[PDB]
């Protein structure tokens, strides 16, 4: 046969992300002396929409500690954050919505978002709209913190990893049906070229492993092992179980 | 209960003197034939003196201590009164309703105000009045 659709996406010719209208990468501040010792105050100048992202973004301006100028940061806004609000980031920050604190400086049960996997990577966890991380325990020895992830997995993270108090704004977006093909078209127009999708059983054998036959059927089990090679991994990959 | 008197220090809010510190000389609570509103006669600073250090020479110190005054009639709503005071008896008489409506008389009055301010700045007192507001 020929190269199947899911193999062609790795070349990245027509499947790259559409990033013309993006506001910029959403990251926390670089962990510096002020963050790890005290705190620094920032001001929210505006809250803006970002193309291809459900959650809104907040523009926060800080003063440069070592030079006379202003530094602008792009944060993912939490619910309740408004323009003109003072934002405090650092070890000695208060427990308020929008403040950036390390996970070792908050009590159990605190709701946080934009959580660093490791101290200094500037946010990796709980970034989509409506998602958050729950603090469930601390290990003062060896400096570890136990957290609960949006998928339900339990992870152990260093207590020096930073997080933003609150929950990502824009929740409830997926509860409204798209209701027609046009709305789906404009949604993926700002993300990437993955829509529409043609079913493999509707193709020819040269095109897809599900293709061909005088009837439209798969013909073999759709559960595919983890050890299969590229060109075979079509269907349900390493499925522990199927059905409703 | 009344604080707008003839020695109160206020901050100008509008009119090419916004952000300049001023002192009230003669207040008029109930209007006048002109300016039918609550207003006061004030004398302020147009150009604050520069900071002086020990390294400056005699000729440079005298140049950096110059003060440019001004006289203005200001509405009450365009003033922000403070808790500071400054006696105006040295130039209370020269600044009045008559010193206006005459280009030549205004210049003579401002020369008297400049002498009082410069002597006030020397032997430093009323330091808050001679410090420019940052905004």
């Amino acid at each position: 046969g020929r190269v199947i659709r899911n193999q062609r996406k790795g070349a990245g010719s027509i499947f790259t992300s559409h990033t013309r209208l993006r506001q910029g990468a959403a990251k926390l501040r670089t962990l510096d002396y002020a963050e790890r010792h005290g705190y620094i105050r920032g001001i929210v100048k505006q809250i803006v929409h970002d193309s291809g992202r459900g959650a809104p973004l907040a523009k926060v301006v800080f003063r440069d500690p070592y030079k006379y100028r202003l530094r602008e940061e792009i944060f993912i806004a939490n619910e309740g954050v408004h323009t003109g609000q003072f934002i405090y980031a650092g070890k000695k920050a208060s427990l308020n919505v929008g403040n950036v604190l390390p996970l070792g400086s908050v009590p159990e049960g605190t709701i946080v978002s934009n959580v660093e996997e490791k101290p200094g990577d500037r946010g990796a966890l709980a970034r989509a709209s409506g998602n958050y991380v729950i603090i469930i325990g601390h290990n003062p020895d060896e400096n570890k913190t136990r957290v609960r992830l949006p998928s339900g997995a339990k992870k152990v993270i260093s207590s020096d990893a930073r997080g933003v108090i609150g929950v990502i704004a824009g929740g409830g977006r997926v509860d409204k049906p798209l209701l027609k093909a046009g709305r789906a078209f404009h949604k993926y127009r700002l993300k990437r070229n993955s829509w529409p999708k043609t079913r493999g059983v509707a193709m020819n054998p040269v095109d897809h492993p599900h293709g061909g036959g005088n009837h439209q059927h798969i013909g073999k089990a759709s559960t595919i092992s983890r050890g299969a090679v590229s060109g075979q991994k079509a269907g349900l990959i390493a499925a522990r179980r199927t059905g409703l | 209960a009344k604080f707008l008197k003839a020695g109160k220090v206020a901050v100008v809010v509008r009119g090419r003197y916004a952000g300049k510190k001023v002192v009230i000389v003669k207040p008029h609570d109930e209007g006048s034939k002109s300016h039918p509103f609550g207003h006061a006669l004030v004398a302020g600073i147009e150009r604050y003196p520069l900071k002086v250090t020990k390294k400056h020479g005699a000729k440079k110190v005298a140049k950096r201590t110059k003060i440019k005054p001004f006289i203005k009639v200001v509405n009450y709503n365009h003033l922000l009164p403070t808790r500071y005071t400054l006696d105006v008896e040295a130039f209370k008489s020269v600044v009045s309703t008559e010193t206006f409506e005459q280009p030549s008389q205004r210049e003579e009055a401002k020369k008297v105000v400049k002498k009082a301010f410069e002597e006030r700045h020397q032997a430093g007192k009323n330091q808050w009045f001679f410090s420019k507001l940052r905004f």
């Binding site: 002396y33 002020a34 010792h37 005290g38 705190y39 620094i40 105050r41 003063r63 440069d64 500690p65 070592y66 030079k67 006379y68 650092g90 | 002086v52 250090t53 020990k54 110190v61 201590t65 020397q122 032997a123 430093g124 330091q127």
Partner: peptide, 29 residues
């Protein structure tokens, strides 16, 4: 004497910009 004033700078976290210090330890050689 009456023209010069003492205006100490606060070099704490979040205060005035830090002054120039010796950074020879941190130089990228």
């Amino acid at each position: 004497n009456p023209l010069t004033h003492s205006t100490p700078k606060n070099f704490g976290i979040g205060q005035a910009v830090q002054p120039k210090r010796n950074l020879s330890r941190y130089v990228k050689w």
